Write an enzyme that holds these catalytic residues in place. Structure first.
Site, PDB file in Angstrom:
ATOM      1  N   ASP A  14      -5.000  -6.621   6.806  1.00 49.11           N
ATOM      2  CA  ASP A  14      -5.414  -5.869   5.799  1.00 49.11           C
ATOM      3  C   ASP A  14      -6.739  -5.158   5.291  1.00 49.11           C
ATOM      4  O   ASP A  14      -7.179  -4.592   6.346  1.00 49.11           O
ATOM      5  CB  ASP A  14      -4.623  -6.262   4.373  1.00 49.11           C
ATOM      6  CG  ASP A  14      -4.647  -5.111   3.205  1.00 49.11           C
ATOM      7  OD1 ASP A  14      -3.463  -4.559   3.130  1.00 49.11           O
ATOM      8  OD2 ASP A  14      -5.440  -5.237   2.235  1.00 49.11           O
ATOM      9  N   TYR A  68     -11.061   0.002  -2.839  1.00 50.34           N
ATOM     10  CA  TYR A  68     -10.448   1.121  -3.014  1.00 50.34           C
ATOM     11  C   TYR A  68     -11.120   2.597  -3.510  1.00 50.34           C
ATOM     12  O   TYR A  68     -10.441   3.526  -3.231  1.00 50.34           O
ATOM     13  CB  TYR A  68      -8.966   1.138  -3.579  1.00 50.34           C
ATOM     14  CG  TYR A  68      -8.102   0.327  -3.124  1.00 50.34           C
ATOM     15  CD1 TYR A  68      -6.814   0.765  -2.230  1.00 50.34           C
ATOM     16  CD2 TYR A  68      -7.825  -1.156  -3.244  1.00 50.34           C
ATOM     17  CE1 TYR A  68      -5.920  -0.040  -1.591  1.00 50.34           C
ATOM     18  CE2 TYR A  68      -6.886  -1.844  -2.672  1.00 50.34           C
ATOM     19  CZ  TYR A  68      -5.852  -1.244  -1.998  1.00 50.34           C
ATOM     20  OH  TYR A  68      -4.825  -1.854  -1.432  1.00 50.34           O
ATOM     21  N   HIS A 122       4.373  -7.833   5.514  1.00 51.51           N
ATOM     22  CA  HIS A 122       2.839  -7.574   5.461  1.00 51.51           C
ATOM     23  C   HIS A 122       1.867  -8.840   5.304  1.00 51.51           C
ATOM     24  O   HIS A 122       0.870  -8.672   5.765  1.00 51.51           O
ATOM     25  CB  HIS A 122       2.823  -6.682   4.183  1.00 51.51           C
ATOM     26  CG  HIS A 122       1.237  -6.491   4.059  1.00 51.51           C
ATOM     27  ND1 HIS A 122       0.601  -5.535   4.403  1.00 51.51           N
ATOM     28  CD2 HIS A 122       0.488  -6.990   2.972  1.00 51.51           C
ATOM     29  CE1 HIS A 122      -0.471  -5.529   3.853  1.00 51.51           C
ATOM     30  NE2 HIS A 122      -0.664  -6.466   3.044  1.00 51.51           N
TER      31      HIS A 122
HETATM   32  C1  LIG Z   1       7.154   3.677  -1.091  1.00 51.86           C
HETATM   33  C2  LIG Z   1       7.290   2.118  -0.267  1.00 51.86           C
HETATM   34  C3  LIG Z   1       8.497   1.584  -0.673  1.00 51.86           C
HETATM   35  C4  LIG Z   1       7.346   2.292   1.187  1.00 51.86           C
HETATM   36  O1  LIG Z   1       8.088   3.448   1.664  1.00 51.86           O
HETATM   37  C5  LIG Z   1       9.111   2.909   2.611  1.00 51.86           C
HETATM   38  O2  LIG Z   1       9.744   1.633   2.081  1.00 51.86           O
HETATM   39  C6  LIG Z   1      11.067   1.520   2.698  1.00 51.86           C
HETATM   40  C7  LIG Z   1      10.572   0.967   4.128  1.00 51.86           C
HETATM   41  O3  LIG Z   1      11.764   0.512   4.715  1.00 51.86           O
HETATM   42  C8  LIG Z   1      12.229   2.633   2.672  1.00 51.86           C
HETATM   43  O4  LIG Z   1      13.260   2.470   1.869  1.00 51.86           O
HETATM   44  C9  LIG Z   1      11.110   3.878   2.325  1.00 51.86           C
HETATM   45  O5  LIG Z   1      11.920   5.236   2.656  1.00 51.86           O
HETATM   46  C10 LIG Z   1       9.962   3.870   2.971  1.00 51.86           C
HETATM   47  O6  LIG Z   1      10.103   4.176   4.471  1.00 51.86           O
HETATM   48  C11 LIG Z   1       5.932   2.770   1.572  1.00 51.86           C
HETATM   49  C12 LIG Z   1       4.882   1.759   1.228  1.00 51.86           C
HETATM   50  C13 LIG Z   1       4.739   1.533  -0.191  1.00 51.86           C
HETATM   51  C14 LIG Z   1       3.976   2.970  -0.727  1.00 51.86           C
HETATM   52  C15 LIG Z   1       3.870   0.229  -0.383  1.00 51.86           C
HETATM   53  C16 LIG Z   1       2.234   0.246  -0.274  1.00 51.86           C
HETATM   54  O7  LIG Z   1       1.976   1.363   0.330  1.00 51.86           O
HETATM   55  C17 LIG Z   1       1.426  -0.676  -0.677  1.00 51.86           C
HETATM   56  C18 LIG Z   1       1.781  -1.672  -1.382  1.00 51.86           C
HETATM   57  C19 LIG Z   1       0.891  -2.898  -1.500  1.00 51.86           C
HETATM   58  C20 LIG Z   1      -0.219  -2.887  -0.566  1.00 51.86           C
HETATM   59  C21 LIG Z   1      -1.191  -4.346  -0.665  1.00 51.86           C
HETATM   60  C22 LIG Z   1      -0.524  -4.946  -0.120  1.00 51.86           C
HETATM   61  C23 LIG Z   1      -2.532  -3.994  -0.277  1.00 51.86           C
HETATM   62  N1  LIG Z   1      -2.595  -3.347   1.084  1.00 51.86           N
HETATM   63  C24 LIG Z   1      -2.924  -2.233   1.571  1.00 51.86           C
HETATM   64  O8  LIG Z   1      -3.558  -1.490   0.605  1.00 51.86           O
HETATM   65  N2  LIG Z   1      -3.131  -1.933   2.626  1.00 51.86           N
HETATM   66  C25 LIG Z   1      -3.449  -0.644   2.984  1.00 51.86           C
HETATM   67  C26 LIG Z   1      -5.200  -0.646   3.267  1.00 51.86           C
HETATM   68  C27 LIG Z   1      -5.301  -1.597   4.043  1.00 51.86           C
HETATM   69  C28 LIG Z   1      -6.404  -1.466   5.182  1.00 51.86           C
HETATM   70  O9  LIG Z   1      -7.401  -0.516   4.655  1.00 51.86           O
HETATM   71  C29 LIG Z   1      -7.239   0.628   4.159  1.00 51.86           C
HETATM   72  C30 LIG Z   1      -5.732   0.671   3.930  1.00 51.86           C
HETATM   73  C31 LIG Z   1      -1.103  -4.823  -2.342  1.00 51.86           C
HETATM   74  C32 LIG Z   1       0.105  -4.723  -2.977  1.00 51.86           C
HETATM   75  C33 LIG Z   1       0.962  -3.242  -2.930  1.00 51.86           C
HETATM   76  C34 LIG Z   1       0.000  -2.411  -3.671  1.00 51.86           C
HETATM   77  C35 LIG Z   1       2.320  -3.478  -3.668  1.00 51.86           C
HETATM   78  C36 LIG Z   1       3.170  -2.387  -3.295  1.00 51.86           C
HETATM   79  C37 LIG Z   1       3.166  -1.765  -2.108  1.00 51.86           C
HETATM   80  C38 LIG Z   1       4.127  -2.684  -1.161  1.00 51.86           C
HETATM   81  C39 LIG Z   1       3.911  -0.334  -2.016  1.00 51.86           C
HETATM   82  C40 LIG Z   1       3.087   0.575  -3.141  1.00 51.86           C
HETATM   83  C41 LIG Z   1       5.347  -0.266  -2.537  1.00 51.86           C
HETATM   84  C42 LIG Z   1       5.953   1.100  -2.442  1.00 51.86           C
HETATM   85  C43 LIG Z   1       6.071   1.431  -0.818  1.00 51.86           C
END
Ligand code: A1D78
Ligand code: MG
Length: 546
Positions: free
Chosen positions: A334, A464, A522
């Protein structure tokens, strides 16, 4: 009734029985059967091997005494010995050939998990050979999985003298009726039976485990493959390095060999590598698991600029300097993965090798700015929610148990909702009391809660809040390529760091090696710890050990 299990070493936990090399040597040397066996036990209690097993003399002292016994036993049988005949050669080959009996160790580990007091009881020697290091590592890897290790040469008593059995009972704090003992020599079980302990003669492992299964009423044979060894925080060496007047880095250290530095992501800890640290050390590496700036026991200054990639990378270099390390392998996940890619781009001389889990290397766009792209792709809306200092901090710090129980989940367990900015936060329509994911226990969750009680989410969220700064810095490297050994590992069910964002990395890393994990979310380390360890140890041994 049973409450403890005691395992012999030679022929029970370790195979092949070093004692059995005497027979194979006679056959391979056309010697009279049992000739080498009689020299081993020539004298009984007053013999050299008993003096050896009792700690009175060392192994190197005993070797010339066994050779004499071998020449006195070959005299009475009227047989000459070969010319190159060397007791040291034979015992060296036998000791290094002996490996851990994994199915037996698994049964002991399983019994300890169900509340058994396990121990090793073995007749062994003080090893001062030039190659003693081999047996030292084997005993180290075994030691950690048992409550007690009783070595004959360390207590001055040997099997089958009933005093060592009385010593084991006092160490176990148990009566003979609640103890099961396994050994490959029947003579070593009679004293135990005499005291009334359950005994098992171990000839083949599967039959012994079947007997052990019956007396314990616990399934030990054919049981599922266990998870790799995890870390107990209070059992680790904890290191602290001041890289800057008011900034200290904390790390966990284990193993010897080339330095391997593990860098976690948001919002995690060194504990996120708990399943990798023992394995990597066991594989022959010096593991340094770090509490990244802002996390855990590392310093967490409030200023946003303290967390831009340039400052974080500089501090990692100073970290190596203060530790005396000219190089280290950098493995990140990450945000930690992003950190290691730029370590390789800006300080290649300090990076022996670089590997990233989930996090791909995407070169900065000299045209569009990151803030433009995070808005041009509402998928990154949560990153916009993280921009305003104090907002996300309040939501994430409101209920730490709820926060990590909601985040640390497999890809089939998502309990979070949607666009985050205009919704109200990350937990708007989310369980206040989420269930426990299958990847984590309640105790592992409480460790994260206690770590993040120290400084909160200000420092972590500051990672961030340097989008423009990091972009301007990254643009200085657009002419470079990564040409040191590198490894990218993708996870299929990772929806934040999808495996297709890594498809063009060969353009900038030509000799880049790849690894892929199926049905993995993840949180790669705890989701598929066994597969991660294999991919990383295979790559380290092939590209970092040289
Ligand atoms: C919209 C969806 C559901 C997803 O969309 C797909 O979801 C399904 C896929 O099968 C399908 O249904 C849908 O159609 C589509 O395809 C896209 C990602 C998402 C928008 C997702 C996200 O981006 C990040 C997080 C998480 C991120 C982490 C684990 C921290 N790590 C990162 O910041 N890393 C990137 C950086 C690291 C490297 O350095 C620069 C970049 C902390 C907890 C949380 C905020 C917790 C919340 C999530 C899981 C979050 C917001 C939840 C919502 C979700
Ligand atoms: Mg034995």
């Amino acid at each position: 009734t049973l409450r403890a299990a005691v395992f012999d070493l030679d022929g029970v936990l370790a195979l092949p029985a070093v004692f059995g090399v005497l027979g194979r040597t006679e056959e391979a040397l056309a010697l009279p059967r049992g000739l080498l066996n009689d020299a081993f036990q020539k004298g009984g209690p007053e013999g050299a091997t008993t003096r050896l097993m009792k700690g009175e003399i060392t192994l190197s002292q005993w070797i010339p005494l066994m050779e004499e016994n071998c020449r006195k036993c070959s005299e009475t049988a009227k047989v000459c010995l070969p010319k190159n005949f060397s007791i040291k050669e034979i015992f060296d080959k036998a000791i290094s050939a002996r490996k851990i009996n994994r199915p037996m160790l698994q049964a002991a580990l399983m019994l300890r998990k169900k509340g058994f007091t396990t121990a090793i009881l073995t007749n062994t020697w003080l090893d001062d050979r030039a190659e003693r290091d081999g047996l030292a590592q084997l005993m180290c890897e075994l030691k950690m999985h048992f409550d007690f290790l009783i070595e004959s040469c360390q207590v001055g008593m040997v099997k089958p003298e009933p005093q060592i059995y009385k010593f084991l009972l006092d160490t176990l704090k148990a009566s003979p009726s609640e103890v099961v003992f396994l050994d490959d020599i029947g003579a070593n079980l009679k004293p135990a039976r005499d005291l009334g302990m359950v005994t098992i003669l171990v000839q083949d492992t599967d039959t012994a485990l079947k007997e052990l299964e019956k007396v314990t009423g616990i399934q030990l044979l054919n049981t599922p493959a266990p998870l790799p060894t995890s870390c107990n925080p209070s059992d680790m060496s904890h290191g602290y390095v001041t890289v800057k007047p008011r900034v200290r880095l904390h790390f966990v250290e284990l193993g010897s060999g080339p330095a391997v530095c593990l860098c976690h992501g948001f919002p995690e800890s060194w504990y996120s590598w708990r399943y990798q640290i023992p394995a990597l050390a066991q594989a022959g590496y010096r593991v340094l698991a770090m509490d990244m700036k802002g996390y855990g026991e590392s310093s967490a200054p409030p200023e946003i600029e303290e967390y831009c990639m340039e400052v974080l990378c500089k501090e990692m270099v100073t970290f190596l300097d203060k530790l005396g390390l000219s190089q280290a392998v950098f493995i990140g996940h990450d945000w930690g993965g992003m950190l290691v890619w730029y370590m390789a781009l800006f300080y290649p001389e300090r990076v022996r090798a670089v590997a990233s889990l989930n996090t791909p290397f995407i070169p900065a766009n000299p045209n569009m700015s990151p803030l433009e792209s995070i808005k041009a792709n509402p998928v990154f809306d949560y990153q916009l929610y993280f921009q305003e200092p104090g907002v996300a901090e309040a939501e994430l710090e409101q209920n730490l148990s709820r926060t990590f129980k909601s985040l640390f989940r497999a890809s089939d367990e998502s309990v979070l909702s949607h666009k985050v900015c205009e919704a109200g936060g990350l937990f708007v329509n989310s369980p206040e009391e989420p269930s426990l994911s299958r990847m984590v226990t309640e105790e592992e969750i409480q460790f994260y809660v206690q770590q993040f009680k120290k400084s909160g989410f200000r420092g972590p969220l500051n990672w961030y809040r340097n989008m423009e700064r990091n972009w301007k810095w990254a643009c200085k490297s657009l002419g470079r390529k990564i040409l040191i050994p590198a490894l990218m590992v993708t996870a299929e069910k990772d929806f934040v760091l999808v495996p297709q964002m890594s498809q063009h990395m060969e353009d900038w890393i030509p000799h880049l090696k790849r690894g892929h994990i199926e049905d993995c979310g993840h949180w790669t380390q705890m989701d598929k710890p066994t597969e991660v360890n294999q991919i990383l140890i295979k790559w380290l041994d092939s590209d970092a050990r040289n």
